[PDB]
Every structure is written in C-alpha cells, then in structure tokens.
Amino acid sequence: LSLYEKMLHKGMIIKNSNVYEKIKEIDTIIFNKTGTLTYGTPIVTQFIGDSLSLAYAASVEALSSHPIAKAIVKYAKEQGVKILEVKDFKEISGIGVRGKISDKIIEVKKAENDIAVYINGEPIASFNISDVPRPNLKDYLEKLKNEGLKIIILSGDKEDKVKELSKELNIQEYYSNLSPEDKVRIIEKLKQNGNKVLMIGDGVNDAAALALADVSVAMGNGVDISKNVADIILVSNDIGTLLGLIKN
Ligand SMILES: Nc1ncnc2c1ncn2[C@@H]1O[C@H](COP(=O)(O)O)[C@@H](O)[C@H]1O
C-alpha cells in the first residue's frame, strides 16, 4: 500500500518521512553494541568457585529483580543447587546485594569476572557475565562491500567484550567503555568531518547519540527514550531487514 505500510510490512516503523532522502547520503553506519548487535539479555559465561558459594550467591540474588541477579539465579538452577532462605536482604542500587545465610554475611557485588561473591568480607567466587550476540555477519559484510560503507561499533561495554565481538563480525573500527557523552562527541566529529551517519541503537546509553545521527534506528525491544527520538523503529528487531534497505 502506502510507503509507510510497505515498510511496516517490512518490519519497520517510519516515524520520520524525509528519512528516505536522507539514506542515500549515508556513508557511515554506527552500531551501538548492547541490544543491537546482541540480544539485551545477560548470561553467566563463567562461574569460578564452588557449589556452596554458587548457592549462597543465587539465594541472595533471588530477592532482586535486576537482570544480572536473574542471570545468576538462572545459571545456578541449571547447575542444580536450590534457593536458600536469606535474612536481612539489602539491594544497594550501585554495587549489588547483600544478605545473611546461616550466620554468614553474603554480598554479591560488582568489581571490575566483573561480579564477585563475598562471604564475611572475603571474596570467594565470581561470575563473568556477558551478552548473547545476534546470529549474522555476512549481512554486515554486504554493507562493507555494499556502497563503500564504513562501519563503526560503539558501546559503554568493556574493551574485552567489544574487541571480541568486533573480531567476530570482522569490524576493524570500534570503541569501548563509552558514555553517552563520549558517543555524542564521536558522532559530532564524524558529522563535522562531513560524514553522513546512520546509527542503530537500543536502550538508555544510546538515545542522545541516536538523536544526533543523520538517520537513527531504534530496536523493537528498545527503550522509550530511544524510540521517541528515532527516525525508524525496527519492530522486527531484524537488522538484516534494515541492511537490505541500506542496499537502497
Ligand atoms: N543485583 C545485582 N547483583 C550484582 N551486581 C549488580 C546488581 N545490580 C547492579 N549491579 C552492578 O551495578 C552495575 C550497574 O548497575 P545498573 O546501573 O543498574 O545497570 C552492574 O554492571 C553491576 O556491576
């Protein structure tokens, strides 16, 4: 039907209307990592420590709703340990959680294996938690060879998580440990350098960068601040779908 309907049926909401004109001009495609190149769901990739520590950690995390707490709880159930009764539980907002089991103070909190487990102030185990990447690569390579598109990846994630993923999809140019303010500035430079930037984002740390892109795409599973500022919503959460469109 109408162009809007065609796109919607392609899995794309076009909030803008001028965006088509804008797309022919784009020469730089920037991906925010989290929830764009990956699902937005943290998993335990590794636990270091024993099963008693695992049980303690999950028992305490069972009382939090944070995605990380959930991922630990889920990992432990899969190992087959059961949830223990916790007393004097406390979330902290910044660090993590705390609680008392069998006369032992248990804390599960961040660190830098970012997540540590402390039994009576002594770090006893840790979790390495990370994301699940979306299936694909060729799609992106079709971009590289499509037009002469430069592809950049950005995230507030650590240089280890980002380097690994960029190695994976074969992107040379990426930047890690970035705050929104950093991202705004990188895009700023690019636009000042005369580049036309299309950016795909998803979630809190992407909104301000997206608002500043020449054309902006938010993911379907993306947060509201991101979507109310995006030119396009990939309600399909299917990047490939968006790719094709870039193949004008
Ligand atoms: N329930 C939790 N268990 C362990 N660590 C947490 C928890 N909640 C927050 N954190 C830590 O706090 C950081 C930032 O939290 P957030 O700002 O809410 O995403 C996370 O990356 C974790 O290191």
Side-chain angles (χ1 to χ4, degrees), residues 2-5 7-14 16-20 22-23 25-94 96-109 111-112 114-137 141-159 161-166 168-171 173-204 206-245 248:
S2 62
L3 209 30
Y4 176 88
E5 295 309 333
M7 308 273 74
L8 207 61
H9 177 55
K10 269 114 153 59
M12 295 184 234
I13 304 179
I14 308 297
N16 207 298
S17 245
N18 301 157
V19 41
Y20 314 100
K22 299 194 192 319
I23 306 179
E25 302 185 334
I26 80 85
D27 50 44
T28 303
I29 309 281
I30 301 171
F31 290 93
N32 291 284
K33 196 202 77 148
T34 312
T36 296
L37 301 177
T38 74
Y39 297 98
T41 179
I43 59 153
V44 174
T45 78
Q46 175 139 286
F47 173 68
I48 301 174
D50 70 5
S51 315
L52 175 54
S53 308
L54 177 59
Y56 285 158
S59 305
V60 166
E61 297 280 16
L63 294 183
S64 156
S65 288
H66 195 306
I68 290 192
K70 304 226 237 207
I72 293 181
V73 163
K74 178 180 191 290
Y75 175 81
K77 299 214 206 306
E78 299 167 354
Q79 304 311 322
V81 310
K82 83 190 173 194
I83 297 311
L84 296 183
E85 162 150 59
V86 175
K87 279 162 180 173
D88 313 328
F89 165 81
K90 227 113 294 159
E91 263 166 338
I92 273 73
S93 311
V97 304
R98 167 237 141 85
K100 191 226 288 268
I101 301 163
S102 297
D103 291 310
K104 295 188 197 165
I105 279 49
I106 280 68
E107 300 199 77
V108 187
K109 60 182 175 203
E112 291 128 75
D114 43 295
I115 306 293
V117 174
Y118 296 75
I119 301 176
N120 290 334
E122 206 100 321
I124 208 65
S126 56
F127 294 84
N128 183 251
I129 98 87
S130 78
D131 239 343
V132 190
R134 290 179 199 270
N136 255 225
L137 181 176
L141 216 107
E142 285 192 348
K143 305 298 316 99
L144 283 73
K145 270 124 45 156
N146 189 320
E147 302 200 16
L149 289 184
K150 169 186 37 190
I151 297 187
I152 304 175
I153 301 176
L154 303 180
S155 62
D157 237 45
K158 304 309 165 51
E159 161 90 338
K161 330 226 72 134
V162 183
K163 184 244 308 281
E164 136 251 82
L165 172 67
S166 278
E168 243 133 65
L169 300 167
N170 198 75
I171 306 301
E173 196 155 18
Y174 70 87
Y175 295 130
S176 61
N177 195 24
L178 256 43
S179 58
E181 291 69 43
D182 300 328
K183 289 172 176 164
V184 156
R185 278 170 165 161
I186 295 181
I187 298 169
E188 182 194 14
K189 253 148 180 53
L190 292 168
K191 298 181 69 178
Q192 278 158 348
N193 174 303
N195 288 320
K196 290 284 174 181
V197 174
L198 185 151
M199 165 176 330
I200 306 102
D202 174 288
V204 73
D206 304 349
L210 288 164
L212 191 61
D214 288 276
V215 15
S216 53
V217 189
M219 297 297 298
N221 45 72
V223 308
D224 275 320
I225 68 177
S226 281
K227 305 157 98 64
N228 324 136
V229 114
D231 292 311
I232 299 172
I233 316 296
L234 248 201
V235 303
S236 67
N237 298 303
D238 196 81
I239 318 298
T241 301
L242 167 70
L243 141 55
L245 190 62
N248 279 264

mmCIF file of all heavy atoms in Angstrom, residues 4-52, unseen atoms left out:
data_model
loop_
_atom_site.group_PDB
_atom_site.id
_atom_site.type_symbol
_atom_site.label_atom_id
_atom_site.label_comp_id
_atom_site.label_asym_id
_atom_site.label_seq_id
_atom_site.Cartn_x
_atom_site.Cartn_y
_atom_site.Cartn_z
ATOM 1 N N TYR A 4 4.563 3.887 3.944
ATOM 2 C CA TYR A 4 4.589 3.577 5.367
ATOM 3 C C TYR A 4 4.165 2.131 5.608
ATOM 4 O O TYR A 4 4.781 1.412 6.404
ATOM 5 C CB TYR A 4 3.690 4.548 6.145
ATOM 6 C CG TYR A 4 3.574 4.250 7.631
ATOM 7 C CD1 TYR A 4 4.483 4.780 8.544
ATOM 8 C CD2 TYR A 4 2.553 3.448 8.119
ATOM 9 C CE1 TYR A 4 4.375 4.513 9.897
ATOM 10 C CE2 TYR A 4 2.435 3.177 9.475
ATOM 11 C CZ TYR A 4 3.348 3.712 10.354
ATOM 12 O OH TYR A 4 3.234 3.434 11.693
ATOM 13 N N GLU A 5 3.117 1.710 4.904
ATOM 14 C CA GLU A 5 2.566 0.365 5.056
ATOM 15 C C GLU A 5 3.509 -0.683 4.498
ATOM 16 O O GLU A 5 3.686 -1.749 5.089
ATOM 17 C CB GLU A 5 1.209 0.255 4.359
ATOM 18 C CG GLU A 5 0.138 1.129 4.970
ATOM 19 C CD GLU A 5 0.033 0.939 6.465
ATOM 20 O OE1 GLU A 5 0.384 -0.162 6.955
ATOM 21 O OE2 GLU A 5 -0.402 1.894 7.149
ATOM 22 N N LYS A 6 4.105 -0.384 3.351
ATOM 23 C CA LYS A 6 5.100 -1.275 2.778
ATOM 24 C C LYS A 6 6.206 -1.541 3.809
ATOM 25 O O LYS A 6 6.511 -2.688 4.123
ATOM 26 C CB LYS A 6 5.665 -0.695 1.476
ATOM 27 N N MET A 7 6.784 -0.476 4.354
ATOM 28 C CA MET A 7 7.841 -0.594 5.354
ATOM 29 C C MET A 7 7.378 -1.356 6.593
ATOM 30 O O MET A 7 8.054 -2.269 7.059
ATOM 31 C CB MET A 7 8.309 0.796 5.760
ATOM 32 C CG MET A 7 8.674 1.690 4.586
ATOM 33 S SD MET A 7 10.384 1.476 4.089
ATOM 34 C CE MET A 7 10.321 -0.117 3.272
ATOM 35 N N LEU A 8 6.223 -0.973 7.123
ATOM 36 C CA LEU A 8 5.664 -1.645 8.289
ATOM 37 C C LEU A 8 5.594 -3.142 8.037
ATOM 38 O O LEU A 8 5.857 -3.956 8.934
ATOM 39 C CB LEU A 8 4.269 -1.116 8.594
ATOM 40 C CG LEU A 8 3.902 -1.242 10.065
ATOM 41 C CD1 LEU A 8 4.894 -0.422 10.899
ATOM 42 C CD2 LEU A 8 2.471 -0.794 10.313
ATOM 43 N N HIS A 9 5.238 -3.495 6.804
ATOM 44 C CA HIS A 9 5.162 -4.892 6.413
ATOM 45 C C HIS A 9 6.560 -5.454 6.212
ATOM 46 O O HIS A 9 6.760 -6.664 6.249
ATOM 47 C CB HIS A 9 4.321 -5.076 5.152
ATOM 48 C CG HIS A 9 4.267 -6.493 4.671
ATOM 49 N ND1 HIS A 9 3.861 -7.537 5.478
ATOM 50 C CD2 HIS A 9 4.575 -7.041 3.473
ATOM 51 C CE1 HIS A 9 3.915 -8.666 4.793
ATOM 52 N NE2 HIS A 9 4.345 -8.391 3.573
ATOM 53 N N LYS A 10 7.528 -4.569 6.007
ATOM 54 C CA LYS A 10 8.925 -4.984 6.034
ATOM 55 C C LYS A 10 9.475 -5.038 7.462
ATOM 56 O O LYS A 10 10.607 -5.450 7.661
ATOM 57 C CB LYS A 10 9.795 -4.072 5.172
ATOM 58 C CG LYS A 10 9.946 -4.522 3.730
ATOM 59 C CD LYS A 10 9.294 -3.529 2.771
ATOM 60 C CE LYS A 10 9.964 -3.560 1.395
ATOM 61 N NZ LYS A 10 9.924 -4.910 0.746
ATOM 62 N N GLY A 11 8.669 -4.641 8.448
ATOM 63 C CA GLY A 11 9.076 -4.713 9.847
ATOM 64 C C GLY A 11 9.673 -3.410 10.369
ATOM 65 O O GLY A 11 10.445 -3.390 11.337
ATOM 66 N N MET A 12 9.304 -2.312 9.718
ATOM 67 C CA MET A 12 9.875 -1.017 10.017
ATOM 68 C C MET A 12 8.821 0.061 10.156
ATOM 69 O O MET A 12 8.045 0.306 9.231
ATOM 70 C CB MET A 12 10.860 -0.622 8.925
ATOM 71 C CG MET A 12 12.050 -1.537 8.864
ATOM 72 S SD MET A 12 13.247 -0.980 7.647
ATOM 73 C CE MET A 12 13.400 -2.469 6.673
ATOM 74 N N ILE A 13 8.810 0.711 11.317
ATOM 75 C CA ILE A 13 8.010 1.913 11.509
ATOM 76 C C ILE A 13 8.801 3.164 11.130
ATOM 77 O O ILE A 13 9.842 3.469 11.732
ATOM 78 C CB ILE A 13 7.592 2.092 12.964
ATOM 79 C CG1 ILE A 13 6.842 0.866 13.474
ATOM 80 C CG2 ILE A 13 6.761 3.364 13.121
ATOM 81 C CD1 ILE A 13 6.426 1.003 14.946
ATOM 82 N N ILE A 14 8.291 3.899 10.149
ATOM 83 C CA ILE A 14 8.902 5.155 9.745
ATOM 84 C C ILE A 14 8.234 6.345 10.428
ATOM 85 O O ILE A 14 7.251 6.887 9.933
ATOM 86 C CB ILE A 14 8.839 5.346 8.218
ATOM 87 C CG1 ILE A 14 9.399 4.113 7.510
ATOM 88 C CG2 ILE A 14 9.601 6.613 7.797
ATOM 89 C CD1 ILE A 14 10.866 3.843 7.809
ATOM 90 N N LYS A 15 8.777 6.745 11.573
ATOM 91 C CA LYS A 15 8.278 7.914 12.291
ATOM 92 C C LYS A 15 8.515 9.182 11.469
ATOM 93 O O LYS A 15 7.623 10.017 11.335
ATOM 94 C CB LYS A 15 8.943 8.022 13.667
ATOM 95 N N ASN A 16 9.726 9.310 10.925
ATOM 96 C CA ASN A 16 10.089 10.398 10.012
ATOM 97 C C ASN A 16 9.320 10.239 8.697
ATOM 98 O O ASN A 16 8.430 9.393 8.593
ATOM 99 C CB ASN A 16 11.599 10.357 9.744
ATOM 100 C CG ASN A 16 12.191 11.726 9.382
ATOM 101 O OD1 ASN A 16 11.831 12.335 8.366
ATOM 102 N ND2 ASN A 16 13.140 12.187 10.190
ATOM 103 N N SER A 17 9.668 11.045 7.701
ATOM 104 C CA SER A 17 9.085 10.953 6.360
ATOM 105 C C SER A 17 10.166 11.345 5.357
ATOM 106 O O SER A 17 10.191 10.862 4.221
ATOM 107 C CB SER A 17 7.874 11.889 6.223
ATOM 108 O OG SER A 17 6.663 11.171 6.027
ATOM 109 N N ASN A 18 11.065 12.223 5.801
ATOM 110 C CA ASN A 18 12.204 12.655 4.991
ATOM 111 C C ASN A 18 13.352 11.652 4.988
ATOM 112 O O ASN A 18 14.347 11.834 4.286
ATOM 113 C CB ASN A 18 12.746 14.005 5.480
ATOM 114 C CG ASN A 18 11.708 15.111 5.436
ATOM 115 O OD1 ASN A 18 11.823 16.099 6.160
ATOM 116 N ND2 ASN A 18 10.685 14.951 4.592
ATOM 117 N N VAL A 19 13.215 10.598 5.783
ATOM 118 C CA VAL A 19 14.333 9.696 6.009
ATOM 119 C C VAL A 19 14.844 9.030 4.731
ATOM 120 O O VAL A 19 16.048 8.873 4.555
ATOM 121 C CB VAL A 19 14.018 8.660 7.101
ATOM 122 C CG1 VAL A 19 12.589 8.146 6.960
ATOM 123 C CG2 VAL A 19 15.036 7.529 7.064
ATOM 124 N N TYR A 20 13.940 8.661 3.832
ATOM 125 C CA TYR A 20 14.342 8.052 2.567
ATOM 126 C C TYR A 20 15.391 8.899 1.841
ATOM 127 O O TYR A 20 16.462 8.413 1.477
ATOM 128 C CB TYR A 20 13.126 7.860 1.667
ATOM 129 C CG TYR A 20 11.929 7.268 2.366
ATOM 130 C CD1 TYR A 20 10.877 8.075 2.792
ATOM 131 C CD2 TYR A 20 11.846 5.900 2.601
ATOM 132 C CE1 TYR A 20 9.767 7.528 3.436
ATOM 133 C CE2 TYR A 20 10.751 5.346 3.244
ATOM 134 C CZ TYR A 20 9.710 6.160 3.657
ATOM 135 O OH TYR A 20 8.616 5.606 4.296
ATOM 136 N N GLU A 21 15.073 10.171 1.627
ATOM 137 C CA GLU A 21 16.026 11.108 1.046
ATOM 138 C C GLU A 21 17.368 11.057 1.784
ATOM 139 O O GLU A 21 18.439 11.087 1.161
ATOM 140 C CB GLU A 21 15.465 12.542 1.075
ATOM 141 N N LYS A 22 17.302 10.972 3.112
ATOM 142 C CA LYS A 22 18.496 11.055 3.943
ATOM 143 C C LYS A 22 19.375 9.832 3.814
ATOM 144 O O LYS A 22 20.584 9.923 3.987
ATOM 145 C CB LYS A 22 18.128 11.277 5.408
ATOM 146 C CG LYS A 22 17.353 12.561 5.663
ATOM 147 C CD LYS A 22 17.288 12.918 7.146
ATOM 148 C CE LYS A 22 16.272 14.029 7.389
ATOM 149 N NZ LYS A 22 16.335 15.095 6.335
ATOM 150 N N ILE A 23 18.773 8.691 3.496
ATOM 151 C CA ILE A 23 19.510 7.428 3.499
ATOM 152 C C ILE A 23 20.487 7.306 2.336
ATOM 153 O O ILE A 23 21.539 6.683 2.471
ATOM 154 C CB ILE A 23 18.571 6.213 3.498
ATOM 155 C CG1 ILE A 23 17.584 6.312 4.653
ATOM 156 C CG2 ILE A 23 19.357 4.919 3.623
ATOM 157 C CD1 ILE A 23 16.607 5.165 4.713
ATOM 158 N N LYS A 24 20.145 7.887 1.192
ATOM 159 C CA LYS A 24 21.007 7.751 0.025
ATOM 160 C C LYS A 24 22.348 8.377 0.346
ATOM 161 O O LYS A 24 23.388 7.943 -0.151
ATOM 162 C CB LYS A 24 20.382 8.400 -1.212
ATOM 163 N N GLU A 25 22.316 9.380 1.219
ATOM 164 C CA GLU A 25 23.505 10.150 1.540
ATOM 165 C C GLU A 25 24.445 9.465 2.521
ATOM 166 O O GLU A 25 25.609 9.863 2.645
ATOM 167 C CB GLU A 25 23.109 11.498 2.127
ATOM 168 C CG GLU A 25 22.228 12.352 1.242
ATOM 169 C CD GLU A 25 21.990 13.725 1.847
ATOM 170 O OE1 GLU A 25 22.058 13.844 3.094
ATOM 171 O OE2 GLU A 25 21.742 14.681 1.078
ATOM 172 N N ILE A 26 23.952 8.457 3.239
ATOM 173 C CA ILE A 26 24.739 7.927 4.352
ATOM 174 C C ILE A 26 25.952 7.131 3.876
ATOM 175 O O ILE A 26 25.867 6.342 2.937
ATOM 176 C CB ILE A 26 23.900 7.122 5.428
ATOM 177 C CG1 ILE A 26 23.623 5.693 4.968
ATOM 178 C CG2 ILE A 26 22.621 7.867 5.850
ATOM 179 C CD1 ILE A 26 24.757 4.742 5.282
ATOM 180 N N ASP A 27 27.080 7.352 4.541
ATOM 181 C CA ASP A 27 28.316 6.672 4.199
ATOM 182 C C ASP A 27 28.909 5.977 5.422
ATOM 183 O O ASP A 27 29.895 5.248 5.318
ATOM 184 C CB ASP A 27 29.312 7.680 3.642
ATOM 185 C CG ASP A 27 29.448 8.901 4.521
ATOM 186 O OD1 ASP A 27 29.526 8.744 5.757
ATOM 187 O OD2 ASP A 27 29.467 10.024 3.975
ATOM 188 N N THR A 28 28.310 6.213 6.583
ATOM 189 C CA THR A 28 28.821 5.650 7.826
ATOM 190 C C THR A 28 27.688 5.041 8.638
ATOM 191 O O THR A 28 26.691 5.706 8.923
ATOM 192 C CB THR A 28 29.536 6.717 8.662
ATOM 193 O OG1 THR A 28 30.585 7.305 7.884
ATOM 194 C CG2 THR A 28 30.121 6.109 9.929
ATOM 195 N N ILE A 29 27.837 3.767 8.984
ATOM 196 C CA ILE A 29 26.832 3.049 9.767
ATOM 197 C C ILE A 29 27.417 2.722 11.128
ATOM 198 O O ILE A 29 28.388 1.961 11.219
ATOM 199 C CB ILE A 29 26.412 1.714 9.098
ATOM 200 C CG1 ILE A 29 26.021 1.937 7.644
ATOM 201 C CG2 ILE A 29 25.219 1.084 9.835
ATOM 202 C CD1 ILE A 29 24.622 2.500 7.482
ATOM 203 N N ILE A 30 26.847 3.294 12.183
ATOM 204 C CA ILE A 30 27.363 3.015 13.523
ATOM 205 C C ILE A 30 26.427 2.136 14.336
ATOM 206 O O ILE A 30 25.253 2.453 14.485
ATOM 207 C CB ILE A 30 27.608 4.284 14.320
ATOM 208 C CG1 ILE A 30 28.609 5.193 13.593
ATOM 209 C CG2 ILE A 30 28.137 3.916 15.692
ATOM 210 C CD1 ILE A 30 28.753 6.596 14.235
ATOM 211 N N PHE A 31 26.937 1.022 14.840
ATOM 212 C CA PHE A 31 26.132 0.180 15.704
ATOM 213 C C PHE A 31 26.499 0.388 17.146
ATOM 214 O O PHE A 31 27.660 0.230 17.507
ATOM 215 C CB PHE A 31 26.354 -1.286 15.386
ATOM 216 C CG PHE A 31 25.782 -1.709 14.074
ATOM 217 C CD1 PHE A 31 26.557 -1.688 12.930
ATOM 218 C CD2 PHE A 31 24.465 -2.133 13.985
ATOM 219 C CE1 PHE A 31 26.030 -2.091 11.714
ATOM 220 C CE2 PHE A 31 23.931 -2.538 12.778
ATOM 221 C CZ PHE A 31 24.714 -2.519 11.639
ATOM 222 N N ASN A 32 25.519 0.745 17.970
ATOM 223 C CA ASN A 32 25.657 0.535 19.404
ATOM 224 C C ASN A 32 25.581 -0.958 19.669
ATOM 225 O O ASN A 32 24.749 -1.650 19.088
ATOM 226 C CB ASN A 32 24.567 1.262 20.177
ATOM 227 C CG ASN A 32 24.725 2.759 20.113
ATOM 228 O OD1 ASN A 32 25.591 3.330 20.788
ATOM 229 N ND2 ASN A 32 23.891 3.415 19.292
ATOM 230 N N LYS A 33 26.454 -1.461 20.530
ATOM 231 C CA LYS A 33 26.535 -2.893 20.759
ATOM 232 C C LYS A 33 25.275 -3.461 21.417
ATOM 233 O O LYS A 33 24.486 -4.152 20.768
ATOM 234 C CB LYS A 33 27.767 -3.250 21.598
ATOM 235 C CG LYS A 33 28.115 -4.737 21.551
ATOM 236 C CD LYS A 33 28.955 -5.243 22.718
ATOM 237 C CE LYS A 33 28.110 -5.433 23.960
ATOM 238 N NZ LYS A 33 28.613 -6.548 24.814
ATOM 239 N N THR A 34 25.097 -3.158 22.702
ATOM 240 C CA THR A 34 24.126 -3.852 23.558
ATOM 241 C C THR A 34 22.690 -3.791 23.062
ATOM 242 O O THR A 34 22.112 -2.720 22.949
ATOM 243 C CB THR A 34 24.154 -3.302 25.008
ATOM 244 O OG1 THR A 34 25.507 -3.228 25.466
ATOM 245 C CG2 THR A 34 23.379 -4.212 25.936
ATOM 246 N N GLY A 35 22.101 -4.947 22.794
ATOM 247 C CA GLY A 35 20.711 -4.996 22.378
ATOM 248 C C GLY A 35 20.523 -4.665 20.911
ATOM 249 O O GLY A 35 19.401 -4.667 20.402
ATOM 250 N N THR A 36 21.618 -4.365 20.223
ATOM 251 C CA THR A 36 21.560 -4.132 18.784
ATOM 252 C C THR A 36 22.285 -5.271 18.081
ATOM 253 O O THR A 36 21.654 -6.095 17.431
ATOM 254 C CB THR A 36 22.134 -2.748 18.383
ATOM 255 O OG1 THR A 36 21.320 -1.719 18.948
ATOM 256 C CG2 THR A 36 22.107 -2.567 16.895
ATOM 257 N N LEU A 37 23.602 -5.335 18.234
ATOM 258 C CA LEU A 37 24.362 -6.478 17.749
ATOM 259 C C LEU A 37 24.217 -7.693 18.673
ATOM 260 O O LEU A 37 24.632 -8.801 18.338
ATOM 261 C CB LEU A 37 25.837 -6.104 17.602
ATOM 262 C CG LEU A 37 26.132 -4.943 16.652
ATOM 263 C CD1 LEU A 37 27.614 -4.621 16.649
ATOM 264 C CD2 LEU A 37 25.669 -5.273 15.245
ATOM 265 N N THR A 38 23.627 -7.485 19.842
ATOM 266 C CA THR A 38 23.394 -8.578 20.781
ATOM 267 C C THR A 38 21.964 -8.502 21.243
ATOM 268 O O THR A 38 21.327 -7.465 21.111
ATOM 269 C CB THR A 38 24.217 -8.423 22.070
ATOM 270 O OG1 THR A 38 23.637 -7.382 22.867
ATOM 271 C CG2 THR A 38 25.681 -8.121 21.773
ATOM 272 N N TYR A 39 21.461 -9.598 21.798
ATOM 273 C CA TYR A 39 20.201 -9.560 22.498
ATOM 274 C C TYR A 39 20.502 -8.757 23.757
ATOM 275 O O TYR A 39 21.663 -8.606 24.143
ATOM 276 C CB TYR A 39 19.735 -10.977 22.827
ATOM 277 C CG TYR A 39 19.466 -11.827 21.595
ATOM 278 C CD1 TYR A 39 20.419 -12.728 21.125
ATOM 279 C CD2 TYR A 39 18.257 -11.730 20.902
ATOM 280 C CE1 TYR A 39 20.177 -13.515 20.005
ATOM 281 C CE2 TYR A 39 18.003 -12.509 19.766
ATOM 282 C CZ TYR A 39 18.970 -13.401 19.327
ATOM 283 O OH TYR A 39 18.738 -14.182 18.212
ATOM 284 N N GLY A 40 19.484 -8.215 24.400
ATOM 285 C CA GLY A 40 19.762 -7.374 25.544
ATOM 286 C C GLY A 40 19.735 -8.166 26.829
ATOM 287 O O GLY A 40 19.338 -7.655 27.871
ATOM 288 N N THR A 41 20.162 -9.419 26.769
ATOM 289 C CA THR A 41 19.984 -10.296 27.917
ATOM 290 C C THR A 41 21.264 -10.968 28.408
ATOM 291 O O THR A 41 21.810 -11.853 27.743
ATOM 292 C CB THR A 41 18.924 -11.360 27.636
ATOM 293 O OG1 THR A 41 18.807 -12.216 28.780
ATOM 294 C CG2 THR A 41 19.310 -12.174 26.408
ATOM 295 N N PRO A 42 21.727 -10.555 29.593
ATOM 296 C CA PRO A 42 22.946 -11.030 30.260
ATOM 297 C C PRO A 42 22.855 -12.496 30.679
ATOM 298 O O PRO A 42 21.816 -12.942 31.169
ATOM 299 C CB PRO A 42 23.028 -10.146 31.507
ATOM 300 C CG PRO A 42 22.189 -8.934 31.176
ATOM 301 C CD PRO A 42 21.061 -9.498 30.368
ATOM 302 N N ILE A 43 23.943 -13.229 30.466
ATOM 303 C CA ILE A 43 24.063 -14.611 30.892
ATOM 304 C C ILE A 43 25.366 -14.801 31.669
ATOM 305 O O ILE A 43 26.302 -14.005 31.544
ATOM 306 C CB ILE A 43 24.108 -15.576 29.685
ATOM 307 C CG1 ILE A 43 25.290 -15.228 28.771
ATOM 308 C CG2 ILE A 43 22.786 -15.556 28.890
ATOM 309 C CD1 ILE A 43 25.827 -16.421 27.957
ATOM 310 N N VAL A 44 25.421 -15.861 32.473
ATOM 311 C CA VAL A 44 26.670 -16.287 33.073
ATOM 312 C C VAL A 44 27.471 -17.061 32.035
ATOM 313 O O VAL A 44 27.004 -18.082 31.515
ATOM 314 C CB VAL A 44 26.430 -17.169 34.303
ATOM 315 C CG1 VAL A 44 27.748 -17.720 34.823
ATOM 316 C CG2 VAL A 44 25.719 -16.368 35.387
ATOM 317 N N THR A 45 28.657 -16.556 31.705
ATOM 318 C CA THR A 45 29.531 -17.245 30.759
ATOM 319 C C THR A 45 30.480 -18.094 31.577
ATOM 320 O O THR A 45 30.932 -19.153 31.143
ATOM 321 C CB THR A 45 30.353 -16.270 29.870
ATOM 322 O OG1 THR A 45 31.450 -15.747 30.615
ATOM 323 C CG2 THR A 45 29.513 -15.106 29.386
ATOM 324 N N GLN A 46 30.773 -17.628 32.785
ATOM 325 C CA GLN A 46 31.609 -18.408 33.669
ATOM 326 C C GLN A 46 31.424 -18.114 35.155
ATOM 327 O O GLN A 46 31.278 -16.958 35.577
ATOM 328 C CB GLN A 46 33.080 -18.272 33.277
ATOM 329 C CG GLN A 46 34.003 -18.980 34.237
ATOM 330 C CD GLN A 46 35.114 -19.693 33.523
ATOM 331 O OE1 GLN A 46 34.898 -20.743 32.909
ATOM 332 N NE2 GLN A 46 36.320 -19.125 33.586
ATOM 333 N N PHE A 47 31.434 -19.188 35.931
ATOM 334 C CA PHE A 47 31.442 -19.109 37.375
ATOM 335 C C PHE A 47 32.741 -19.708 37.866
ATOM 336 O O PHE A 47 33.107 -20.811 37.459
ATOM 337 C CB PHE A 47 30.293 -19.917 37.971
ATOM 338 C CG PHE A 47 30.346 -20.016 39.465
ATOM 339 C CD1 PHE A 47 30.142 -18.891 40.256
ATOM 340 C CD2 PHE A 47 30.612 -21.216 40.082
ATOM 341 C CE1 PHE A 47 30.196 -18.977 41.638
ATOM 342 C CE2 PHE A 47 30.667 -21.307 41.466
ATOM 343 C CZ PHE A 47 30.455 -20.179 42.243
ATOM 344 N N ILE A 48 33.435 -18.983 38.731
ATOM 345 C CA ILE A 48 34.617 -19.518 39.391
ATOM 346 C C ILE A 48 34.398 -19.605 40.885
ATOM 347 O O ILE A 48 34.223 -18.589 41.535
ATOM 348 C CB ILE A 48 35.814 -18.612 39.207
ATOM 349 C CG1 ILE A 48 36.132 -18.434 37.718
ATOM 350 C CG2 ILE A 48 36.989 -19.201 39.959
ATOM 351 C CD1 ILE A 48 37.241 -17.427 37.430
ATOM 352 N N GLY A 49 34.408 -20.812 41.425
ATOM 353 C CA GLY A 49 34.164 -21.015 42.838
ATOM 354 C C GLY A 49 33.447 -22.337 42.986
ATOM 355 O O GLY A 49 33.313 -23.060 42.006
ATOM 356 N N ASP A 50 32.980 -22.670 44.188
ATOM 357 C CA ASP A 50 32.325 -23.959 44.376
ATOM 358 C C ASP A 50 30.811 -23.839 44.512
ATOM 359 O O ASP A 50 30.256 -22.743 44.497
ATOM 360 C CB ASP A 50 32.926 -24.732 45.550
ATOM 361 C CG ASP A 50 32.585 -24.115 46.913
ATOM 362 O OD1 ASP A 50 31.802 -23.131 46.984
ATOM 363 O OD2 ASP A 50 33.109 -24.640 47.922
ATOM 364 N N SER A 51 30.147 -24.979 44.661
ATOM 365 C CA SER A 51 28.693 -25.029 44.598
ATOM 366 C C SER A 51 28.056 -24.395 45.831
ATOM 367 O O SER A 51 26.936 -23.887 45.764
ATOM 368 C CB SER A 51 28.227 -26.467 44.438
ATOM 369 O OG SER A 51 29.010 -27.116 43.460
ATOM 370 N N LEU A 52 28.756 -24.418 46.957
ATOM 371 C CA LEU A 52 28.199 -23.797 48.151
ATOM 372 C C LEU A 52 28.137 -22.287 47.947
ATOM 373 O O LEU A 52 27.126 -21.659 48.260
ATOM 374 C CB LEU A 52 28.996 -24.161 49.403
ATOM 375 C CG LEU A 52 28.520 -23.438 50.670
ATOM 376 C CD1 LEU A 52 27.009 -23.649 50.914
ATOM 377 C CD2 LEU A 52 29.354 -23.848 51.888
#
